[PDB]
Automatic annotation (TrEMBL), chain C:
SUPFAM superfamilies: L30e-like
Pfam families to which the protein is assigned, alphabetical: Ribosomal_L7Ae
Domain of life: Eukaryota
The name this protein goes by in its record: 40S ribosomal protein S12
Gene3D superfamilies documented for this protein: 3.30.1330.30
GO-annotated cellular components: ribonucleoprotein complex; ribosome
Ribosomal protein eL8/eL30/eS12/Gadd45 domain location: 4-96
Entry keywords, A to Z: Ribonucleoprotein, Ribosomal protein
Automatic annotation (TrEMBL), chain D:
Keywords: Ribonucleoprotein, Ribosomal protein
GO CC annotation, single: cytosolic small ribosomal subunit
Residue segments, region Disordered: 1-34
GO process annotations (BP): translation
Family membership noted in the UniProt record: Belongs to the eukaryotic ribosomal protein eS30 family.
Species in which this protein is naturally found: Kluyveromyces lactis (strain ATCC 8585 / CBS 2359 / DSM 70799 / NBRC 1267 / NRRL Y-1140 / WM37)
Record protein name field: 40S ribosomal protein S30
GO molecular function: structural constituent of ribosome
Xref: Pfam families: Ribosomal_S30
Bilayer-spanning residue ranges: none
Superkingdom to which the source organism belongs: Eukaryota
C-alpha cells in the first residue's frame, strides 16, 4: 500500500493504446492527444507495463509530439483516480 | 519496509495547564489591624499545623499540604 | 554592621535557613521557625513591609537593610558563577533566617544589640 | 512524489542551485611573483615529504 501521486504543473495522465518496441509507446493523453510516450528513468526494467495501462507522463514544452512517461499505477490506484475523477470517465477499462 | 503517512488528528488541541500566578498573592491572605495586631482572612489547617490556609471554593474548605485528606463542608 | 548579615545569610544558605520570599517568610514567622527577618523599606505601596512588621510582632528581631536588589545579590539568590554578577536582575523583598547554623561571636553580639534596640 | 517537477525541463539544476556569492580575497600576485611563490611553496618549503608532494591535500 503506497500513496498515489497526483499530477502537478505539466505532468498529466494518459492510457497506453499500443506499446511499440525499443522502449516506445503510443499513449492517449486525456486532452485528445494521441501522443508518443517514451519509457524513461526508474522505469526501464524495474516496473513492467503493458497494453491498456493507466499511466502518468511529463510533457516537453519545447516539443509536444513526444512526451516522457514517469509513473505507472497498478489498476487499483487507477480505481482511486477513477472515483476522484480527475481523468475523463467516458472510458471503461476493466478486467 | 514501512510506508507511514503524516498523522491526522480529529482533536483540536489539549493545552498545557498554565499555573494561575497571582501578583501580591500573600497579602490577600492576611489583614493588618491598624499598626499592630494582624489577622488571617483564610482559615488555618489543623492537620498540617499553624500557618497553612484553607481553600474556600463553594460550601467547603480545602487544604493544600494534606489537600487530599481534608475537604470539610462549610 | 555588614559582616554579620552576610555571615548569617551564608550560615542559613548552607543549611537551608533562608525563607527567600514573603509567603515562605510569612509561613515561617507564623510557625515557630523564623529567627530573623531582613526587609527593605524601598517597597512600593509599603503594605508588604507593614504586614511583615505584624508577622514579627507576634521570632521577634527584624533588620532594616535597604537596597532590595543588592539585598538579594548578597543574600545568595544568585548562581554567581563568575567573580562578577552573572545575572541581570535578582532580589528578595523579605529574607527570613530560620536555622542559625554556625555561630560567630560578632554576629551574636550584633543580634543581642538589635534585640536591645 | 516520484519527481518534484516536470522531468524534461531544461536548465533545471542550474535554476535551483543555491546562489553562493564569491568570497572576497586578497590579491593573488601574478607573473614572476606567482612563479616565485610556487617555487617557494614546492621546493624550499617542502610540506608533506611523506608519500607524494600531495599539492591540494584534502582536509580529513
Ligand atoms: Mg529507450
Ligand atoms: Zn492540611
Amino acid at each position: 500500500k503506497r500513496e498515489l501521486i497526483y499530477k502537478e504543473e505539466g505532468q498529466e495522465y494518459a492510457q497506453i493504446t499500443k506499446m511499440l518496441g525499443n522502449g516506445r509507446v503510443e499513449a492517449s493523453c486525456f486532452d485528445g492527444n494521441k501522443r508518443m510516450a517514451h519509457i524513461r528513468g526508474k522505469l526501464r526494467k524495474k516496473v513492467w507495463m503493458g497494453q491498456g495501462d493507466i499511466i502518468l507522463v511529463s510533457l516537453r514544452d519545447f516539443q509536444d509530439d513526444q512526451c516522457d512517461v514517469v509513473h505507472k499505477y497498478n489498476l487499483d490506484e487507477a480505481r482511486t483516480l477513477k472515483n476522484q475523477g480527475e481523468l475523463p470517465e467516458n472510458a471503461k477499462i476493466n478486467e | 519496509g514501512k510506508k507511514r503517512k503524516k498523522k491526522v488528528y480529529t482533536t483540536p488541541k489539549k493545552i498545557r495547564h498554565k499555573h494561575k500566578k497571582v501578583k501580591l498573592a500573600v497579602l490577600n491572605y492576611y489583614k493588618v489591624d491598624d499598626e499592630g495586631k494582624v489577622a488571617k482572612l483564610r482559615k488555618e489547617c489543623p492537620n498540617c499545623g499553624p500557618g497553612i490556609f484553607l481553600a474556600n471554593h463553594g460550601d467547603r474548605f480545602y487544604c493544600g499540604k494534606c489537600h487530599s485528606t481534608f475537604a470539610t463542608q462549610k | 554592621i555588614e559582616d554579620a548579615l552576610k555571615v548569617v545569610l551564608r550560615t542559613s544558605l548552607v543549611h537551608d535557613g533562608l525563607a527567600r520570599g514573603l509567603r515562605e517568610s510569612a509561613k515561617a514567622l507564623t510557625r515557630g521557625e523564623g529567627q530573623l527577618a531582613v526587609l527593605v523599606e524601598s517597597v512600593t505601596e509599603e503594605a508588604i513591609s507593614k504586614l511583615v512588621q505584624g508577622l514579627a510582632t507576634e521570632n521577634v528581631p527584624l533588620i532594616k537593610v535597604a537596597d532590595a536588589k543588592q539585598l538579594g545579590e548578597w543574600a545568595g539568590l544568585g548562581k554567581i558563577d563568575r567573580d562578577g554578577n552573572a545575572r541581570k536582575v535578582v532580589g528578595a523583598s523579605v529574607v527570613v533566617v530560620k536555622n542559625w547554623g554556625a555561630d560567630t561571636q560578632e554576629r551574636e553580639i550584633l543580634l543581642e544589640h538589635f534585640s536591645q534596640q | 512524489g516520484k519527481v518534484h517537477g516536470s522531468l524534461a525541463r531544461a536548465g533545471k539544476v542550474k535554476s535551483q542551485t543555491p546562489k553562493v556569492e564569491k568570497q572576497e580575497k586578497p590579491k593573488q600576485p601574478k607573473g614572476r611573483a606567482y612563479k616565485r611563490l610556487l617555487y617557494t611553496r614546492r621546493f624550499v618549503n617542502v610540506t608533506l615529504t611523506n608519500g607524494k608532494r600531495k599539492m591540494n591535500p584534502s582536509p580529513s
